[PDB]
Amino acid sequence: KFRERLKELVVPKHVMDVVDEELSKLGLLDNHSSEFNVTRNYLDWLTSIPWGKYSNENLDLA
Amino acid sequence: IEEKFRERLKELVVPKHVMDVVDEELSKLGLLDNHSSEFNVTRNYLDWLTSIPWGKYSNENLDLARAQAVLEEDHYGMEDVKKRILEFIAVSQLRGSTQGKILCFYGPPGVGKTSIARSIARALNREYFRFSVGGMTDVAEIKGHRRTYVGAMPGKIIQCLKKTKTENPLILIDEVDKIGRGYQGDPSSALLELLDPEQNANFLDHYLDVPVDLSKVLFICTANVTDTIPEPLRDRMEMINVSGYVAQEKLAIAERYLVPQARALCGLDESKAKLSSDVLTLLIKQYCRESGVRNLQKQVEKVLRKSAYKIVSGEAESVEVTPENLQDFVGKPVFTVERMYDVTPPGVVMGLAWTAMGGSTLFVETSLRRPQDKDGSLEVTGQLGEVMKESARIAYTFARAFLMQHAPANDYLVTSHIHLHVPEGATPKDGPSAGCTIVTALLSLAMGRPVRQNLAMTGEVSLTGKILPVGGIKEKTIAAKRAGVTCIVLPAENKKDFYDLAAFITEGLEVHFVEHYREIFDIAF
């Protein structure tokens, strides 16, 4: 479910190789627990940050 | 037990960002063991999350008539604070929704800054809560501790919201100027998080771990001096100066509030112990000349307790106080004499001075130091400051110049040696307010003519004789009226200060406003 939030966003490898590991850790931990909550937050706000989104700068001085 | 937490949430319009936390916490409660410690901490966390009010606002009374009637019911004479509150209601009617401000009341002790908060809350129909940050050393009182700790509890603000059960109460933060800058976490940083509109809307408590909207609460902060509140804090809250009370106002509170309450806490009826208006006015004049009302309360309580002792001991069945025997109850008068001179000799002129204990009268005496009908000199004594010494020099030069043209044949000032004294040796005095008084004293000594016998004056003088505005007009006017002055001279630039005063202060004074000293010369001679 977290992967779809970065499907349309370019993600660097050095964090993508941690996203899947943390997702596996979430999938092996028991539901609704302290460690589960921490891993849920960590996955959520890895997949929420805009790795591949760049705002267009204004090139015109006018 | 989950159904109880669920039913507690029916009347609350809970925001999603905390409703989703509540849902998973109930899930954890449904997954944990019955007697586990983690179960207990989770259940306490849900109790706190469901007891905090979400969306509940008290029915704020908006009627500007009923609110006002509440304001004058409890406190007398605090016009500025009452007007500020009634213009909070107005602005919150024209906007439509309950609004919040962060208001700071500062002033001398015992003027009603702390007590008016309850009356304001009553007028607004808002829940009232008070906590004092004086001597506060740690941040855990405001922001709490993480719930992972054994004895974790939320901060003062969360307990306030839980007790008041409304999201728009009146929170009185007392002694914000004396908050202690502790080592392990400065609580002033948390006060900055509370008193900041851009972030108080999502104030986060360590125990709750969720933000709460404190933009609707009316923070009232009470302080003594504005010079020592932290700089990022004092710039984000409106400063309202609660000034002290004049003698007539003090009489009003005494007759209306202080004496009845003292009788209630003493048991003496008006028949057993008589306290007429004249006795109270004498107490104000001679003993209670401060700015607050605590000294007046203590004096009234002293009189009533001495009357109670007289009644209980069987010395008398009733005690009646008179101005002839008030000193038998309250001892030696603090201010027994208002003016040194009743009829001024030629060399002296009456002036006015500012003082914390109300206005003060000063006289300027000049005398001939050496026998004479090379040049003259002026000796100056009286613990006069450097600025006042310079003012005396300027006044001496202008007096010489003025007498050179008004009375060309009169060479008294340029040849005679003169000593000028302000007769209070132990008290230091400073400021240029006495320039016109010094000029008048020198000219009256030179001409051998006393000034008007009920005249007082104050005002800075230039080298060419122009009169400049001076400060402390209220205190000087009060001192003049108290000392029986009928005619007072003021700079023309102080007309707005003089007419800003209450009508009962300036009622009996024949005030004159002047631009140049020649007008003062025409008035005094």
Ligand SMILES: Nc1ncnc2c1ncn2[C@@H]1O[C@H](COP(=O)(O)OP(=O)(O)O)[C@@H](O)[C@H]1O
């Ligand atoms: N204007 C006033 N009218 C009536 N009572 C007053 C007034 N100002 C102060 N008081 C009384 O003084 C007492 C203490 O005042 P307080 O609120 O402590 O002043 P401060 O906040 O300056 O310390 C209160 O019980 C209150 O009844």
Ligand SMILES: [Mg+2]
């Ligand atoms: Mg107070």
